[PDB]
Design a protein around this ligand. Structure first.
Ligand SMILES: CO[C@@H]1O[C@H](CO)[C@@H](O[C@H]2O[C@H](CO)[C@@H](O)[C@H](O)[C@@H]2O)[C@H](O)[C@@H]1O
Ligand SMILES: CO[C@@H]1O[C@H](CO)[C@@H](O[C@H]2O[C@H](CO)[C@@H](O)[C@H](O)[C@@H]2O)[C@H](O)[C@@H]1O
Ligand SMILES: CO[C@@H]1O[C@H](CO)[C@@H](O[C@H]2O[C@H](CO)[C@@H](O)[C@H](O)[C@@H]2O)[C@H](O)[C@@H]1O
Ligand SMILES: CO[C@@H]1O[C@H](CO)[C@@H](O[C@H]2O[C@H](CO)[C@@H](O)[C@H](O)[C@@H]2O)[C@H](O)[C@@H]1O
Ligand SMILES: [Ca+2]
Ligand SMILES: [Ca+2]
Ligand SMILES: [Ca+2]
Ligand SMILES: [Ca+2]
Ligand SMILES: [Mn+2]
Ligand SMILES: [Mn+2]
Ligand SMILES: [Mn+2]
Ligand SMILES: [Mn+2]
Lengths: 234, 234, 234, 234
């Protein structure tokens, strides 16, 4: 199957597959079952920012998700991505809804990858606006691009209303050389801003930044808790 | 045909199609017939650096090609690329050889594009090493990468000898949103380092940084003086 | 006297010293009388963005001022800053009021200078928030920072009314190496956002991004039309 | 006393003050006795690169030192710099010699600090060439800027012989806002390349990248094992 590294913003506690019992940020290493999570107070209708940092030297992948009021959740996990990911990846954003739903609107997304040495290859991109025809994004599933200049990872009605049973991803068009055996530093960071809104009995299921093999597609049966990322909950 | 914007480092004077009567740098707007050129002292077997800058605000596309000894050639041309390129492009490097030849070796290539509203979309990439399998490059024609870490735009026979009638291009894999209706600034810059060596009677034909439609292909019969860029010399 | 290169967002037409008879953006080289201006529709109480770009290849000092509604004014002047500016400079933002006044509120300020040859010396700074004690800014005259996170270049009264006869500047703390003899490309760009509000008839006098000798000081009497930049209107 | 956070490339084992008995990279928090070290194979006369990474999410101060042959040593220490450093700092490079000596030649140095949110303040500087009058560097002690275009932190004799009992530092001219209470991510990276040569088969004492109070100066008697950083070996 695909190889996945993700930072999930998991709005829906699927405790029966190992979620903690609250919305959480988590770090997923080849499994929807986060290796580390932190409780996350998802702020309905508020614009959140998720910052993801992989420090290749410290071998530590960290994430924070914050809201303008300063409330944040952080998670770090010690991992050497050289041992996890293929050298070449796509990077992307994934979201899903299930029986419960929420908007999984991306308002901005940037990524920087650097491979040093022995000089530097780098890739940076920044989206503060997404066009109707956002040619440098591979949209998968229900993901669509704006207006309102946004990336809507999952189905939302034109009049704002999240759809259940939706899964969508957007991967940057170019493959990213995420590590190299001879790379002294293979670091990357990503940030995205998001607006998760639910009228629902509960928001679900979340948004993930993910890093996948280049040919990654939405696994069959990965709406809901899986979060467009994984074929199963193992 | 394709829509081409290029900075050519034209090593071979094809005076019958309007080249000046010397190696030159030129700015090509939809035609191999440079809109502006500057005499360029190509330094055989030395590593040169081409810096290309497009100032969206000043509407000026500028290039300098320099060598470590300080010798440089400069060309500017006033142009509004909004009126020239499609909104979405690929960027790349092209080189060709004809009846005469040269190595068209790219040692590094970086590109930065920014679309500014007040919010910014940006793309930056940097290649200081090219891998044998450089997945974020579209190699066209004779272009190859590695394992010496270089991008060889045209055929070079392994003991280092350039091949005649060779054309090759490397385009960045992702499409580039190079201008937008709504962009107050749609600037970009590109840098590449190159090694043109010719054992010959003359080097030919040159290297170009180019910006083309996304689906740009080497036009048929564009080895030689057409630099892998144009179908004809109009 | 200081050496001043400035981009002025001149809100008040001082036609007696060669302002055109409208608000304008201007390129100033060692005179407050801009070498080039463009008519500027200043939008009272709206956040404008000024982008300023220069490189030593094109040698075109360009500036655009835009507002979110999409109105922009652009001015460019070819000028070889090697022959104007000292090698080392400070960069800054300056504003003034005279008989008439306006808030000259700076909301953000970014600047990048680069000196390139082989593959670079660079400086980049970005302020999206100014601190009450912004230790990397030299505030001169009436300029103040914080706690609203803004830089107020000129005097704003407690009731929000801007004051007349005010001048203030902020320069980045470090000297900037703006050109270097052996640099193949010396480039800078600057971006700032500003909020010019004038409760009535008329806003004055303007805001400028400037580059000056490192010890640059507000010239005495440089309120008003001298924009905190020039000792006189010559 | 100054507050010092440093990454030391310690060439000389001072086992009497708790160095391990081999050249090492160390993370130093308010003591010369590194909180963490890794064994470092210092390659005399080869150009090394140190990369130093920290962000306030992962709070892992990481450093790698590498050489072009691909030998590297890495050290990381989780430390909450919010609780160590003043909010504003200067950043610098320091080196020393004592009884034994080495050139402590800096060939490049770059640095980026960013404070996100809710947007970004950033500082970036890069020196690949140092100048004789490098106005954006505060040189302390024996530190000199060339040509050769290098920063020589410690005294090197006319005949190229490094001198003993030398200490010198270069700090970037502007204060750096290293953390901020409301910032979701405060990050810094530093890289420098260095050339440590000892004719005397006995190199000492090392080079450090350091972050200190803005008024940091070379502690008296901080030659030798104190690396120009600490007043004592506590
Ligand atoms: C065993 O009963 C299950 O109940 C849950 C929730 O009622 C449901 O989960 C679905 O919706 C959630 C939230 O969107 C997702 O996390 C799941 O993948 C799934 O789609 C099950 O379907 C069952 O009814
Ligand atoms: C009419 O005679 C032509 O002369 C030139 C050169 O002798 C030749 O051009 C070919 O080679 C050059 C140099 O590589 C290229 O610029 C051209 O495109 C072409 O391939 C013509 O073929 C004829 O000989
Ligand atoms: C002519 O005497 C003055 O009247 C002018 C206005 O014409 C005034 O100018 C001051 O204010 C303007 C607008 O703010 C500035 O551009 C000038 O530099 C100056 O400050 C004079 O001060 C007298 O009142
Ligand atoms: C013990 O008396 C000293 O001998 C030591 C060497 O053990 C010497 O130390 C100096 O040199 C080392 C290596 O350069 C530094 O690490 C020390 O700080 C110091 O400068 C003493 O000075 C005496 O010679
Ligand atoms: Ca879940
Ligand atoms: Ca030609
Ligand atoms: Ca005026
Ligand atoms: Ca020691
Ligand atoms: Mn989860
Ligand atoms: Mn030509
Ligand atoms: Mn004016
Ligand atoms: Mn030590």
């Amino acid at each position: 199957a695909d190889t996945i590294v993700a930072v999930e913003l998991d709005t829906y506690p699927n405790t029966d597959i190992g979620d903690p019992n609250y919305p959480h940020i988590g770090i997923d290493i080849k499994s929807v079952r986060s290796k580390k999570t932190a409780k996350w107070n998802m702020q309905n209708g508020k614009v959140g920012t998720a910052h993801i940092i992989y420090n290749s030297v410290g071998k530590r992948l960290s994430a924070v998700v914050s809201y303008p009021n300063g409330d944040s959740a952080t998670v770090s996990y010690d991992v050497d991505l050289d041992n996890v990911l293929p050298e070449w990846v796509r990077v992307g954003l994934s979201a899903s809804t299930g029986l419960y739903k929420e908007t999984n609107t991306i308002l901005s997304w940037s990524f920087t990858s650097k491979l040093k040495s022995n000089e530097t290859n780098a890739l940076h991109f920044m989206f503060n606006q997404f066009s109707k025809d956002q040619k440098d994004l591979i949209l998968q599933g229900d993901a669509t691009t704006g207006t309102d200049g946004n990336l809507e990872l999952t189905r939302v009605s034109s009049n704002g209303s999240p759809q259940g049973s939706s899964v969508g991803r957007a991967l940057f068009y170019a493959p990213v050389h995420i590590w190299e055996s001879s790379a002294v530093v293979a670091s990357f960071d990503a940030t995205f801003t998001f607006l998760i809104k639910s009228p629902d009995s509960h928001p679900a299921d979340g948004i993930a930044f993910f890093i996948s093999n280049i040919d990654s597609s939405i696994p069959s049966g990965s709406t809901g808790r899986l979060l467009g990322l994984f074929p199963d909950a193992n």
